[PDB]
Amino acid sequence: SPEQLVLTLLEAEPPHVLISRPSAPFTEASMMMSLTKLADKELVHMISWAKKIPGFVELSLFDQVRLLESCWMEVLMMGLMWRSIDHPGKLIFAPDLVLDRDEGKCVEGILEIFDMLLATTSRFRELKLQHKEYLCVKAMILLNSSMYPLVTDSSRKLAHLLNAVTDALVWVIAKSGISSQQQSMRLANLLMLLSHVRHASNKGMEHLLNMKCKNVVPVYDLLLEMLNA
């Protein structure tokens, strides 16, 4: 139910992971070390987050795993964009790791990703994305992956959940009071951005899978596992 669902998501928010710039100037290697080290630690906390979304832990293990494998980069990116929303030209990876757009030039292929992330963040800024809208959209990201049958009532449970989250977002938007037509337009504008997040996510994944090829960074643990696919 919408008020309670929204409160749960609010209370589910993962902690901000702290990381600092290296002492020495960035290199391609050390920049990727920082961002993947951050990502690995955020993944640990993403799991606890997911488990706090009502219904999530009632899905079958495979469904839980499959949604998280599918959406984790999108969710890292969406949390990054929310952190950065008020700081044009910057990506607020952590309180002490604030990258200017130009710093992506440090690593081959990453400027384009920064630019995609920055443009999507500016669109959310232009729409004046509210905290409670971001909570619902981020949860919609987790829950809205293609599934196709796997060969292993979870899937009906998934549909009900996503439904409730989408209802909660519609309910949040109705608080603004704007015209019925404008509430439809805002919903569309928000959801159409899900594509942009998926698209950036795809470019991010491929970057990381390739870096990992080149051994331009060693990757560890949860992050390595998620990537191994």
Binding site: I47, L61, E69, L222, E225, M226, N228
Partner: peptide, 10 residues
């Protein structure tokens, strides 16, 4: 395969 993920979900 999801050796560590299974671990944190369960």
């Amino acid at each position: 395969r999801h050796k560590i993920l299974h671990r944190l979900l369960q």
